[PDB]
Amino acid sequence: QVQLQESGPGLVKPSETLSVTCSVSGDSMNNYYWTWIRQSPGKGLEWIGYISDRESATYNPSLNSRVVISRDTSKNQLSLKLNSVTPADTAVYYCATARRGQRIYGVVSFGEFFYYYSMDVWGKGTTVTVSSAS
C-alpha cells in the first residue's frame, strides 16, 4: 500500500507560503517517480508539475513557476511549497506518481519519439482556505 499521506496547515492568508507534504510508505522511493496534482472547486484537475529522480523540478508555465516543489529522502516525503499564496489557491491538493512512459512514433536514433507521463496511484488531498478567516 503506497498511501500518499498529505498534511497542510489548512489555514492561510493571501501572499504567503503554503506547505503540504506527501508521505510515502509501503513502497520504496527510488524505484519510480512521484509528482504533485491539485484540483480547484469549480475547475478541473490542475497539476503543480512533476519531479523526477534528477530532481530538476519541471514547473508549470500556467502557474508562473510561483510554486516551490522538492522532496526529502530521510523523512521519505514529497515537498510542495506555495510561496506568495494567491487568493485563488482555495483548492484540494492531491499527490501523484509518475510513470516515465515511452511513446515512439519513428526511430530512436533521430529522436523521433517522446515521453508520455502515466499516473497510477494518487492521494486523497486536503482543502485550504485563503482569507482573513482562521
Binding site: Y105, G106, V107, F110, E112
Partner: protein, 51 residues
C-alpha cells in the same frame, strides 16, 4: 493570376517526420568488401583504404 495557378504544399497530415533511406548493413558491408578488394587490386595489392 488569370489562367495561372501554383500547387503549394498543404498541412503534413500525421506526425511531422523526415525522409529516411534504409540500407541493409550486411549487404552494404559485403559490397564494400568486394569494392575495397578490387580497389586494393587496382591500387597496389593490399593497402589501408578508408571510406
Amino acid at each position: 493570376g488569370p489562367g495561372q495557378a501554383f500547387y503549394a504544399t498543404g498541412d503534413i497530415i500525421g506526425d511531422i517526420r523526415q525522409a529516411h533511406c534504409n540500407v541493409s548493413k550486411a549487404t552494404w558491408n559485403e559490397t564494400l568488401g568486394k569494392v575495397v578488394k578490387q580497389l586494393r587490386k587496382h591500387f597496389g595489392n593490399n593497402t589501408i583504404i578508408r571510406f
